[PDB]
Design an enzyme around this catalytic site. Structure first.
Site, PDB file in Angstrom:
ATOM      1  N   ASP A  92       6.768  -6.063  -5.720  1.00 17.07           N
ATOM      2  CA  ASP A  92       6.858  -4.940  -6.662  1.00 17.07           C
ATOM      3  C   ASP A  92       8.328  -4.534  -6.777  1.00 17.07           C
ATOM      4  OD1 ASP A  92       5.247  -2.348  -7.864  1.00 17.07           O
ATOM      5  OD2 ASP A  92       6.667  -1.651  -6.302  1.00 17.07           O
ATOM      6  N   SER A  93       8.668  -3.797  -7.829  1.00 16.93           N
ATOM      7  CA  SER A  93      10.081  -3.516  -8.059  1.00 16.93           C
ATOM      8  C   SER A  93      10.579  -2.330  -7.239  1.00 16.93           C
ATOM      9  CB  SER A  93      10.310  -3.223  -9.532  1.00 16.93           C
ATOM     10  OG  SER A  93       9.857  -1.885  -9.801  1.00 16.93           O
ATOM     11  N   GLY A  94       9.614  -1.573  -6.744  1.00 13.62           N
ATOM     12  CA  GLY A  94       9.749  -0.445  -5.867  1.00 13.62           C
ATOM     13  C   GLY A  94       9.817   0.881  -6.581  1.00 13.62           C
ATOM     14  N   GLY A  95       9.900   0.843  -7.899  1.00  9.57           N
ATOM     15  CA  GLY A  95      10.013   2.093  -8.632  1.00  9.57           C
ATOM     16  C   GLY A  95       8.788   2.976  -8.617  1.00  9.57           C
ATOM     17  N   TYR A  96       7.582   2.426  -8.678  1.00 11.35           N
ATOM     18  CA  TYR A  96       6.362   3.234  -8.723  1.00 11.35           C
ATOM     19  C   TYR A  96       6.303   4.153  -7.523  1.00 11.35           C
ATOM     20  CZ  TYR A  96       1.450   4.647  -9.096  1.00 11.35           C
ATOM     21  OH  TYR A  96       0.289   5.381  -9.185  1.00 11.35           O
ATOM     22  N   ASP A 138      10.769  -0.973 -13.977  1.00 15.81           N
ATOM     23  CA  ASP A 138      10.294  -0.184 -15.075  1.00 15.81           C
ATOM     24  C   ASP A 138      10.085   1.287 -14.694  1.00 15.81           C
ATOM     25  OD1 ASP A 138       8.073  -0.355 -13.415  1.00 15.81           O
ATOM     26  OD2 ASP A 138       6.643  -0.567 -15.040  1.00 15.81           O
ATOM     27  N   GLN A 185       4.387  -0.856 -21.128  1.00 18.16           N
ATOM     28  CA  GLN A 185       4.301   0.561 -21.156  1.00 18.16           C
ATOM     29  C   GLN A 185       3.858   1.006 -22.543  1.00 18.16           C
ATOM     30  OE1 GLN A 185       4.277   2.186 -18.456  1.00 18.16           O
ATOM     31  NE2 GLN A 185       5.048   0.656 -17.009  1.00 18.16           N
ATOM     32  N   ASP A 262      -3.717  -5.975  -8.236  1.00 15.46           N
ATOM     33  CA  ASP A 262      -3.341  -5.493  -6.911  1.00 15.46           C
ATOM     34  C   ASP A 262      -3.837  -4.057  -6.781  1.00 15.46           C
ATOM     35  OD1 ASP A 262      -0.841  -4.260  -8.401  1.00 15.46           O
ATOM     36  OD2 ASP A 262      -0.894  -3.375  -6.365  1.00 15.46           O
ATOM     37  N   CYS A 300     -22.449 -11.184   2.550  1.00 11.66           N
ATOM     38  CA  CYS A 300     -21.040 -11.477   2.781  1.00 11.66           C
ATOM     39  C   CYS A 300     -20.838 -12.617   3.773  1.00 11.66           C
ATOM     40  CB  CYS A 300     -20.333 -10.217   3.310  1.00 11.66           C
ATOM     41  SG  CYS A 300     -18.552 -10.437   3.623  1.00 11.66           S
ATOM     42  N   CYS A 302     -18.045 -13.166   5.383  1.00 11.97           N
ATOM     43  CA  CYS A 302     -16.852 -12.991   6.235  1.00 11.97           C
ATOM     44  C   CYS A 302     -17.175 -13.069   7.720  1.00 11.97           C
ATOM     45  CB  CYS A 302     -16.154 -11.694   5.855  1.00 11.97           C
ATOM     46  SG  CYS A 302     -16.589 -10.189   6.732  1.00 11.97           S
ATOM     47  N   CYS A 305     -19.046  -9.970   9.207  1.00  8.95           N
ATOM     48  CA  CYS A 305     -20.476  -9.920   8.890  1.00  8.95           C
ATOM     49  C   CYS A 305     -21.223 -11.012   9.635  1.00  8.95           C
ATOM     50  CB  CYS A 305     -20.711  -9.945   7.390  1.00  8.95           C
ATOM     51  SG  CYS A 305     -20.122  -8.408   6.593  1.00  8.95           S
ATOM     52  N   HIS A 331     -13.285  -7.212   6.373  1.00 10.34           N
ATOM     53  CA  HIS A 331     -14.463  -7.253   5.508  1.00 10.34           C
ATOM     54  C   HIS A 331     -14.101  -6.886   4.072  1.00 10.34           C
ATOM     55  CE1 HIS A 331     -18.322  -6.734   3.683  1.00 10.34           C
ATOM     56  NE2 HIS A 331     -17.924  -5.500   3.312  1.00 10.34           N
TER      57      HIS A 331
HETATM   58  C1  LIG Z   1      -2.825   2.805  -8.561  1.00  8.92           C
HETATM   59  N1  LIG Z   1      -2.311   2.878  -9.941  1.00  8.92           N
HETATM   60  C2  LIG Z   1      -1.142   2.292 -10.297  1.00  8.92           C
HETATM   61  N2  LIG Z   1      -0.669   2.348 -11.554  1.00  8.92           N
HETATM   62  C3  LIG Z   1       0.493   1.692 -11.619  1.00  8.92           C
HETATM   63  C4  LIG Z   1       1.343   1.486 -12.701  1.00  8.92           C
HETATM   64  C5  LIG Z   1       2.499   0.743 -12.419  1.00  8.92           C
HETATM   65  C6  LIG Z   1       3.509   0.448 -13.495  1.00  8.92           C
HETATM   66  O1  LIG Z   1       3.346   0.851 -14.642  1.00  8.92           O
HETATM   67  N3  LIG Z   1       4.612  -0.281 -13.149  1.00  8.92           N
HETATM   68  C7  LIG Z   1       4.755  -0.708 -11.866  1.00  8.92           C
HETATM   69  N4  LIG Z   1       3.904  -0.470 -10.909  1.00  8.92           N
HETATM   70  C8  LIG Z   1       2.770   0.245 -11.129  1.00  8.92           C
HETATM   71  C9  LIG Z   1       1.900   0.461 -10.054  1.00  8.92           C
HETATM   72  C10 LIG Z   1       2.098  -0.103  -8.644  1.00  8.92           C
HETATM   73  C11 LIG Z   1       1.059  -1.215  -8.366  1.00  8.92           C
HETATM   74  N5  LIG Z   1       0.946  -1.537  -6.927  1.00  8.92           N
HETATM   75  C12 LIG Z   1       2.231  -1.673  -6.200  1.00  8.92           C
HETATM   76  C13 LIG Z   1       1.986  -1.803  -4.652  1.00  8.92           C
HETATM   77  C14 LIG Z   1       3.299  -2.156  -3.900  1.00  8.92           C
HETATM   78  C15 LIG Z   1       3.097  -1.563  -2.506  1.00  8.92           C
HETATM   79  C16 LIG Z   1       2.153  -0.360  -2.645  1.00  8.92           C
HETATM   80  C17 LIG Z   1       1.584  -0.403  -4.086  1.00  8.92           C
HETATM   81  C18 LIG Z   1       0.756   1.206 -10.352  1.00  8.92           C
HETATM   82  N6  LIG Z   1      -0.276   1.590  -9.547  1.00  8.92           N
HETATM   83 ZN   LIG Z   2     -18.178  -9.085   5.470  1.00 11.47          ZN
END
Ligand SMILES: CNc1nc2cc3c(=O)[nH]cnc3c(CCNCC3CCCC3)c2[nH]1
Ligand SMILES: [Zn+2]
Ligand SMILES: CNc1nc2cc3c(=O)[nH]cnc3c(CCNCC3CCCC3)c2[nH]1
Ligand SMILES: [Zn+2]
EC number: 2.4.2.29
Lengths: 364, 364
Positions: A92-96, A138, A185, A262, A300, A302, A305, A331
Site C-alpha cells: 500500500d502507498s501508506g496514505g490511507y 493517492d 477516485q 484486501d 471448512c 482448514c 477445523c 481459520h
Molecule cells: C476499509 N476501507 C478502505 N477504503 C479504502 C480506500 C482506499 C483508497 O482510496 N486508496 C488507498 N487505500 C485505500 C484503502 C486501504 C486498503 N487497505 C490497505 C491496508 C494496508 C495495511 C492496513 C490496510 C481503503 N480501505
Molecule cells: Zn476452518
C-alpha cells in the site's frame, strides 16, 4: 515468468477468473490478499498463510516505514527475506492510514515525530521494501463529499498518479521487476469516476484499483458506484477494490468485475472472537459454544477445523490465550481463501450466478 | 506399553539416563516438561511442542480447574482430546499456585468465589483431566522456615501423601492407567528430608519428586540440599525436581540424580524478550540486535533459527506482535529440549562431567 502478465481464462457476465503471472509467482484471480504487520498476517507464520491458499499478501507500508524503517528493511535484504515470504507482495502507498490514523499540500502529506509522505517518497519506500505490486500514492476522499471537494481531491490524486508513474519508471530495478497500479477516485459521482478512469488510462498502469469506497457509504451505495465505475477501467487489466470486505461484499464486487481484494476483517474479527462460517459469522465467546465439540465450520478444510473444537477455541479466546488468536486467524483466512476458490471455480464452470445466490441464501 | 516402567540405560556418577514407558508413550530421561495453560505451551500448537522434542508436557491443573473446569473438560473427552496432545501429560496437584497466587487446615486448603482443595479433590480433578502422571497433593514449605514449621509442614504433607495414594487407588480406571508421584518436603534440613523420604517409600509411589526448592534459597543451597536429599529416594524410580529451572540449574541437578524437570522460564523469558543461547541468554529487545542477521543461536536446530534473524524477532518483540511471542517461545523450548538431548547423550557416552564443564565455561 514475466514481470507482469494478466490472463483471463473465463468469464460470466462482468465476473472474470484468471491469473496474474509475476517473477515471484502466480496469483489466481479473483484474489483475496491477507493484510499484515511485520508478520505476513498477525499471529501466523508465512508457511501457515501459504497453507491457507494465499498467493500474495499485502505489505503494511505505513507500519513498516515507521518501525523498523524502510531503509533498514532494505539493508536487511528487503521485506520478503525479512518476513520469510518469498511470493508476491503488494504494498500500500501508506496514505490511507496516514490520513486515517497532519497537513495536506500539493507536495504530499505531512504527519506526526513529523514526516512528509509524497508520491515520490511513497514509491521509494515501496521500492526499499522490495514490493512486487506498487500502489500509486493517492487521497482517499472522505465520505460523504460534495461534488466540488470530490473533484478537487480526485484531480490532485490524478496529478499524484502521474508523479507516481514517473517516480516508478525512473527507477530501473523497480520498473523492470515490479508492477504499478493506479487508483480511481471520484467519490460516488459517475462523471468524476469517468474523468479519473480516463486520466489513469492515459497515464497507463499495470492494474487499476477502485479507491474511495468502503468509507461509510454502505453496501447498496458501494455496489451502485461499482456498477458504473468498473466498466470504465480497461477490461484487460486487473481491477482491485481496496479495503473490501465482508464475504457478501466480495461476492457482489466480483459480480461487478473486481478481481482483487484486501481487508483486515478476517484478522481483526478473528482476534475479537468472530469466526466466519458458511452459515454466517459466529461469536465463539458466546456461552452457547462452551461444550460444542463441532469445528468452527462443518465444511471448512482448514487445519483448525480438522483438529480443534468450538469449545476449545471458546475457552482460549475467553482466557485471552495467544493460541486462541492463532487458531481463529488461521481459520478466518482459510475461510476467505476457500470463498475465493469457490468463486474461481464457479466462474470457470459458468455457475457463479447460482453460487452467489446459494451463498447468500445460506449465509443469511 | 505398560502403565508405567522406568528403565535406566546408563549412569555416570549420580547422573542417569533412561526411559519411562507409559500407555500414551515413551519419555526420555533426563526430561524437560514444558508447562502449559489450556495451550500445551502458551503460543504453540501441540505439533510444534512435539517438534521441539518434548515427550511429555505439564498440565496446569490450577488454571484448568477454574476455567473451563475439570468436570467440563472430562465431559468433552479429557485434556488430551481438548488440547490435541495425545502423548503423556503430568498434572500438578494445583496447591503450589493456590498457595502462591486462603485458609489452611488438615482437610486441605480453602481459597478464593471460594473453594476447598484437598488431596481427594486434587486427585479427582487430575483424574477428570485424564492425567497420565498424577502428583500427590502437598504443601510447598515457605523459605526460609524454622525447623519446627518445616517439620509440621512436612508431616502434614506426608499425611496428605497417604490420602493421595488411597484416593488414587480407590479409583480403578486411574489406578490401572496412570502413575502417581509422591513429593519430598523438609525444607533444607537433612533429618526432615530423610523422614520424608522414608514416609513416602513406606507408602510407595511410581516416582518421587523433590519439593520445597527453587523457593528463594539460591542455587548453592539448592544444590547442597539435593546432595543429601536425592540419595534418600529409591534409586530405581524417577526423581523429579519441581519448578527448576535455568539451564545451569538443570545441569547441576542432573549431576545430583534428578531425572525430570518443569519450569515456566523458557516461555516467560521468551515472551519477555529473553532468548537462551549456548553463549548465555540474550535480550532480543536490545538495540544491538536491530540489524543482526544471525539466528538467535548459531548452533540451534530449531525452525526459528533456520528461518528468521535476530533482527526480525527484535522488531516483532518491540512491536508487541504475537508472532514475536510465538517464535521466541518455540526457540526457547527447543533450546531446552536440545540441552536435555545433549545431557542424555553425554551420560550415555560417559562424558557428562566434561559436558557440564564445557557447557558452563561457554554459557558463562
Ligand atoms: C476499509 N476501507 C478502505 N477504503 C479504502 C480506500 C482506499 C483508497 O482510496 N486508496 C488507498 N487505500 C485505500 C484503502 C486501504 C486498503 N487497505 C490497505 C491496508 C494496508 C495495511 C492496513 C490496510 C481503503 N480501505
Ligand atoms: Zn476452518
Ligand atoms: C519455581 N519453583 C517451584 N518450587 C516448587 C515447589 C513445589 C512443591 O514443593 N510441590 C509442588 N509443586 C511445586 C512447584 C510447582 C512446579 N511447577 C508447577 C507448574 C504447574 C503450572 C504452573 C507451574 C514449585 N515450583
Ligand atoms: Zn532456535
Amino acid at each position: 515468468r514475466p514481470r507482469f502478465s494478466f490472463s483471463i481464462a473465463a468469464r460470466e457476465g462482468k465476473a472474470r477468473t484468471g491469473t496474474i503471472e509475476m517473477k515471484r509467482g502466480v496469483i489466481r484471480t479473483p484474489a483475496f490478499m491477507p493484510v499484515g504487520t511485520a508478520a505476513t498476517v498477525k499471529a501466523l507464520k508465512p508457511e501457515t498463510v501459504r497453507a491457507t491458499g494465499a498467493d500474495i499478501i499485502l505489505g503494511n507500508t505505513y507500519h513498516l516505514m515507521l518501525r523498523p524503517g524502510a531503509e533498514r528493511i532494505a539493508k536487511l535484504g528487503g521485506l520478503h527475506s525479512f518476513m520469510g515470504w518469498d511470493r508476491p507482495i503488494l504494498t500500500d502507498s501508506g496514505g490511507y492510514q496516514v490520513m486515517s490514523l497532519t497537513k495536506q499540500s500539493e507536495e504530499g502529506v505531512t504527519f506526526k515525530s513529523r514526516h512528509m509522505l509524497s508520491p515520490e517518497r511513497s514509491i521509494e519506500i515501496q521500492h526499499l521494501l522490495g514490493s512486487d505490486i506498487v500502489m500509486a500514492f493517492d487521497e482517499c476522499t472522505p465520505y460523504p463529499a460534495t461534488p466540488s471537494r470530490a473533484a478537487s481531491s480526485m484531480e490532485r490524486s490524478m496529478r499524484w498518479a502521474k508523479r507516481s508513474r514517473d517516480a516508478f519508471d525512473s527507477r530501473k530495478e523497480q520498473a523492470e521487476n515490479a508492477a504499478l497500479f493506479g487508483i480511481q477516485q471520484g467519490s460516488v459521482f459517475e462523471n468524476l469516476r469517468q474523468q479519473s478512469a480516463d486520466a489513469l488510462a492515459e497515464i497507463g498502469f499495470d492494474g487499476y484499483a477502485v479507491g474511495g469506497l468502503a468509507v461509510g457509504e454502505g453496501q447498496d451505495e458501494m455496489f451502485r458506484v461499482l456498477d458504473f465505475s468498473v466498466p470504465m477501467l480497461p477490461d484487460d487489466k486487473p481491477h482491485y477494490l481496496m479495503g473490501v470486505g465482508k464475504p457478501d461484499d466480495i461476492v457482489g464486487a466480483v459480480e461487478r468485475g473486481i478481481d482483487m481484494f484486501d481487508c483486515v476483517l478476517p484478522t481483526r474479527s478473528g482476534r475479537n472472537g468472530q469466526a466466519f462460517t458458511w452459515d454466517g459469522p459466529i461469536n465463539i465467546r458466546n456461552a452457547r459454544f462452551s461444550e460444542d465439540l463441532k469445528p468452527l465450520d462443518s465444511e471448512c478444510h482448514c487445519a483448525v477445523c480438522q483438529k480443534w473444537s468450538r469449545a476449545y477455541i471458546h475457552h482460549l479466546i475467553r482466557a485471552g490465550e495467544i493460541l486462541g488468536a492463532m487458531l481463529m486467524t488461521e481459520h478466518n483466512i482459510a475461510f476467505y481463501q476457500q470463498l475465493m476458490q469457490k468463486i474461481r471455480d464457479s466462474i470457470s464452470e459458468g455457475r457463479f450466478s447460482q453460487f452467489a445466490q446459494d451463498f447468500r441464501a445460506r449465509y443469511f
